[PDB]
Design a protein around this ligand. Sequence first.
Ligand SMILES: Nc1nc2c(ncn2[C@@H]2O[C@H](COP(=O)(O)OP(=O)(O)OP(=O)(O)O)[C@@H](O)[C@H]2O)c(=O)[nH]1
Ligand SMILES: Nc1ncnc2c1ncn2[C@@H]1O[C@H](COP(=O)(O)OP(=O)(O)CP(=O)(O)O)[C@@H](O)[C@H]1O
Ligand SMILES: Nc1nc2c(ncn2[C@@H]2O[C@H](COP(=O)(O)OP(=O)(O)O)[C@@H](O)[C@H]2O)c(=O)[nH]1
Ligand SMILES: CNc1ccccc1S(C)(=O)=O
Ligand SMILES: CNc1ccccc1S(C)(=O)=O
Ligand SMILES: CNc1ccccc1S(C)(=O)=O
Ligand SMILES: [Ca+2]
Ligand SMILES: [Ca+2]
Ligand SMILES: [Ca+2]
Ligand SMILES: [Mg+2]
Ligand SMILES: [Mg+2]
Ligand SMILES: [Mg+2]
Lengths: 438, 425, 349, 54
Amino acid sequence: MRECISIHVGQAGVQIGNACWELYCLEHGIQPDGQMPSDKTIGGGDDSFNTFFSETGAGKHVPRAVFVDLEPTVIDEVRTGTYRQLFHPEQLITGKEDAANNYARGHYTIGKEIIDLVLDRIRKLADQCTGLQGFLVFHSFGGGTGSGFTSLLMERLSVDYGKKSKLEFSIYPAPQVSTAVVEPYNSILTTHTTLEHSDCAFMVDNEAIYDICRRNLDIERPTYTNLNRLISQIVSSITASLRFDGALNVDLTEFQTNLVPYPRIHFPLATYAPVISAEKAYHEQLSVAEITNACFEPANQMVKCDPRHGKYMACCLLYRGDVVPKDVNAAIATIKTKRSIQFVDWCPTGFKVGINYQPPTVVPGGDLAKVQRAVCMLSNTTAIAEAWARLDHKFDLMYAKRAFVHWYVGEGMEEGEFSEAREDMAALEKDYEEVGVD
Amino acid sequence: MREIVHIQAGQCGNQIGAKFWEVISDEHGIDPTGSYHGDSDLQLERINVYYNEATGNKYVPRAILVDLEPGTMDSVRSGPFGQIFRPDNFVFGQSGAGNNWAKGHYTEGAELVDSVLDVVRKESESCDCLQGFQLTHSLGGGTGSGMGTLLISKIREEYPDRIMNTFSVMPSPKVSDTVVEPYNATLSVHQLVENTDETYCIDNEALYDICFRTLKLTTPTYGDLNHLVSATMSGVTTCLRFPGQLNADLRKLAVNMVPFPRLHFFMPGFAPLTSRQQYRALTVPELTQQMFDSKNMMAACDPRHGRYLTVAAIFRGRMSMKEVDEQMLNVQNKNSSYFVEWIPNNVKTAVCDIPPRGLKMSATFIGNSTAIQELFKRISEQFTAMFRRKAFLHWYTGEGMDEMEFTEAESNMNDLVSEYQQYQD
Amino acid sequence: MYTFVVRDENSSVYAEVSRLLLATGQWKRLRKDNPRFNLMLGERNRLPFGRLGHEPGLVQLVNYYRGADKLCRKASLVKLIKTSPELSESCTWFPESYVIYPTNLTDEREVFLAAYNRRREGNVWIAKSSAGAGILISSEASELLDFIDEQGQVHVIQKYLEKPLLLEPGHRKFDIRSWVLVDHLYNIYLYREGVLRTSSEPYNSANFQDKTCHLTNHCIQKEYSKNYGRYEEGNEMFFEEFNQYLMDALNTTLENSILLQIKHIIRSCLMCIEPAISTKHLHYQSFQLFGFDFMVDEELKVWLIEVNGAPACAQKLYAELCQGIVDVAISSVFPLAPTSIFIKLHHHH
Amino acid sequence: MEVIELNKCTSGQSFEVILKPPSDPSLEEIQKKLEAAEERRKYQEAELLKHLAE
Ligand SMILES: Nc1nc2c(ncn2[C@@H]2O[C@H](COP(=O)(O)OP(=O)(O)OP(=O)(O)O)[C@@H](O)[C@H]2O)c(=O)[nH]1
Ligand SMILES: Nc1ncnc2c1ncn2[C@@H]1O[C@H](COP(=O)(O)OP(=O)(O)CP(=O)(O)O)[C@@H](O)[C@H]1O
Ligand SMILES: Nc1nc2c(ncn2[C@@H]2O[C@H](COP(=O)(O)OP(=O)(O)O)[C@@H](O)[C@H]2O)c(=O)[nH]1
Ligand SMILES: CNc1ccccc1S(C)(=O)=O
Ligand SMILES: CNc1ccccc1S(C)(=O)=O
Ligand SMILES: CNc1ccccc1S(C)(=O)=O
Ligand SMILES: [Ca+2]
Ligand SMILES: [Ca+2]
Ligand SMILES: [Ca+2]
Ligand SMILES: [Mg+2]
Ligand SMILES: [Mg+2]
Ligand SMILES: [Mg+2]
């Protein structure tokens, strides 16, 4: 058994962590006090769930997580919340004043003065591991901490844990749930400095999560609880292989192997179904083909884009619930003859399927309804580059006037790092086009 | 614990600052004796932002009252909530400033500033994590204008990485105490251009027009004008004083509202503005339509004459946040020619459940608009009309100043006008 | 108050639409880079579809279907017809065509010569490309290939219709242009008004060197033809006249002899690519005007030549058609506070 | 359309299908970047205090 340390940075990461570990506990039968009745090995063991949980002599199962925020208001909720007992105080790290939505402030000014502390707490979790696989880093693009401090942490993690793998769960900036005008700057700054340090990144666009909550859940104005509980479902579908017995995506190295043939193009597109309102009278349960066919509908992608106009570099189908290999392939053939799945000539036109029989777990009183089977499709498509274009364009509108640049220079960042970061995204857009277009 | 140190200087400053603490103290359930008697925990949620907690669960405003004459501050001390202020936090002199900037900034003011900074330093030494400062004052007088700007310069020297915020009353010939107000205002504007991060520009002429026309009052008093400033201040500080979905924080506001260091002079406004047909319920469309209308703005500038660099809008009360988003998007998507297209999504909106005392719902408007240049143009013209004849200069040259310094303030602001001009095209 | 942007200054069609939109007093135009717009009359090349449908509160609409280039490119159309089972390589209304890359660069060179050698054992072919006004008509296979190699872009060789239906008097060739508009719901509307771009020169099958009686383009006839505008004004006959001619000469109607096949060809083409370009479940919506060019042989069989993705309209039909676009394509998504001029081609979605 | 590498356990199974065949900075360098910006801040603040002293 090999362990996975999750790092939650900034408000977005920390709150999304709340949703994930809440769900991780309900799935593995863990109580808020850390007790796990089904676990028969008391205070130890190398089970599949031990990749995310340690065990004390008192039978407590402790997440292998670190919560970091430059301001203490968010993490303080965890300290007095329902799962306050799961974590010990060392795992929760908080500063006193945040980065104020300023990448330079979280990376340089504030980041420098606390970087060595976080690493010290991560080293503690690492020392409890007999074979650490790597790290899962949750953060936002727009936040000053999520962007500025994350990239600094990634650089140092590559220095102290050279051979370890690092995956990201990143929140793409969406105006419908943001009051930050400068998030395009932060997103592009942090993608520039993190690119060479992340092996595989899963981008969730808040615009996508916002619409899925309104169209499928009939939530007129969603809250972070609605958004995050849905985000942790996708996260649970993506990390389930690491926490359960299986043969597909058993370690973090398998995520680059099965999803990233080209290093820089390490941003798979996630697709999930079904999402049914719990307030619904009672839904007609969907089949394997219907939920598989939905994986090619834009309305359930974590990033709004058109895969019909791209090329696939890899594809993983993660199923949870009542699904047998016969049904999966049955629906696939039906989709190959109806959809336009154009792969790249240097990649096999195949896909890997993983089936976990336990159907998705639902948070009591949550928004999602209980379903018998669901799927999450990870497909490395050149179509996701549309999100880069959108973002880069907004970055260009403001940078042409140097608007807000003084806030970054004032924290010690040089202006040239801007254009250097933008030139890198321009290279990223060119790569996607050299692989997708003809 | 992100504390704000408040400072009010001079007649206008202390009278306006007074009502400000009279308003928000009511919104947080704090009585004249500092005791809390509200009914919602949201009232105390962020209470320590503006209030210090003393023994006996008493809440003492974190304010510093400053003046060069005792008259105005004595009144506040005898005023409605006069008891609530900290006895020590009154720092005053006896000579006064005679509506002279030079006296407040160079002679009289200099003799008193150190003892003020000793009190500021005292409030900061107890702050867990100080966000920054906010200053109420007028620019047309001598103390709040001349000495206020001196305080800001010295506060920045001792706290260079703290946010400096001010509510600055601009002088109009129609609401004028003396003919030297243009002289005093041009000198302060330069200081503010350098040493503040945000400056809510309140024009006394707009306060009059709102009282006269929109509110239907025959040439009111400074007291009537001040209830508008009270409301405005309570509005722009709502997201700071209550648990809003956003993190608030003065620096975050600055980062999102100030694309360029010198263009940080905001146009405030709010709705409703109803005359005494007052019990009528106001719909979310009505709040939005009026909130963007010029007649509800305190700067006395026509926004349809410039362009919005950034806009903030706080809605207060239990309302349809869906209908709120609908209406805001309807104002933008119906007048997008007045917003710069090189700042994506430059209009942000937050809601606050707690409304102004006695109101079901309200809206506050905060606009960083290039139309503010019309204000600095007025002051510049009024200034040059006298300075071209050196009229009334002897009051200032007699306190040690020189004409050269005036000529620089003049040029400094004409450049500030040019700067607002290049960003409108 | 609806807002739209204009990003193609060279569009004669939507210039009238934008003119009409402004006439209604309910449509406001914005700078070509202001992202807050309801309607985009976008550019031809490299239209940034990825930036559409991401502005909160705005239902956005655009006048191009992303992916239509597959149907409006000389070489793309051929590949789409040969590889799409809906059309099949046995498509009976599209001339035998082949994709030929120049030797300085898949490629169907050998496959073409096989069919050519079979015919030699009418074998007149024509070559053309999308980077032309540059066309060549010849009956020797050596002259067609050597012509393509002298260029640098992809070309297409297809069978030349050696028996084109000739109009009398004049014994002159011609072609038919039909305008088709597809709205956000993917309803195929055929403009009731077509046009015949006729040749003012007598067709001659013993000389393909002179390309004035073979090519019926409005620019060639008005530049290289010396009888331009003799029979019909501007070498443009409309359905009323061409319909009366078919009745006096051939004893048949334009509807039954040609239009049925046209309506069939339009359906089969548009229905084919619907899964790849439909915006039914997309964050924005799309519509687009198309210009279908047909040929008619002496047997009254209709043939598809090409499909233009940014076509022009006959001078006499700009008002009627452009207003039609505002009715069914724009106001259908942004209503404004008949006897339709279109023919709805029902189909299975 | 071949199914390959079918793994089956109590909690699920996984397989692969092939529809069609195919055709850093050191801790030294990071500390320098961090201290470089910190110096730029000290310089900018130095000029501000110089301004204020004037
Ligand atoms: N999906 C989701 N997005 C969030 C959440 N919280 C914040 N965001 C997004 O993150 C962006 C802002 O970044 P934050 O995480 O709040 O900033 P930060 O990391 O705390 O850094 P600071 O500026 O110092 O506060 C906005 O675009 C939000 O939409 C969350 O709980 N869920
Ligand atoms: N296979 C074929 N048989 C007979 N005539 C043909 C032909 N291919 C092309 N033509 C002639 O060429 C003309 C159309 O040329 P084509 O449309 O390919 O060039 P083009 O695309 O530059 C003009 P357009 O503006 O209609 O797009 C017609 O008038 C037709 O007579
Ligand atoms: N809105 C408002 N403006 C005031 C008030 N008192 C004075 N002013 C304005 O401020 C300017 C005079 O400043 P003053 O208060 O005398 O400043 P001081 O020298 O510091 O006391 C004039 O333009 C007045 O119109 C007040 O109570 N409310
Ligand atoms: C508050 N009113 C005021 C104050 C000073 C000078 C003149 C006036 S007024 C507008 O009544 O002419
Ligand atoms: C009339 N508005 C008002 C009055 C008193 C206190 C606060 C407000 S506000 C601008 O926040 O709505
Ligand atoms: C007063 N500022 C405000 C109000 C509502 C929403 C957002 C903001 S902010 C701090 O992002 O500019
Ligand atoms: Ca165990
Ligand atoms: Ca590495
Ligand atoms: Ca003295
Ligand atoms: Mg934060
Ligand atoms: Mg006075
Ligand atoms: Mg053409």
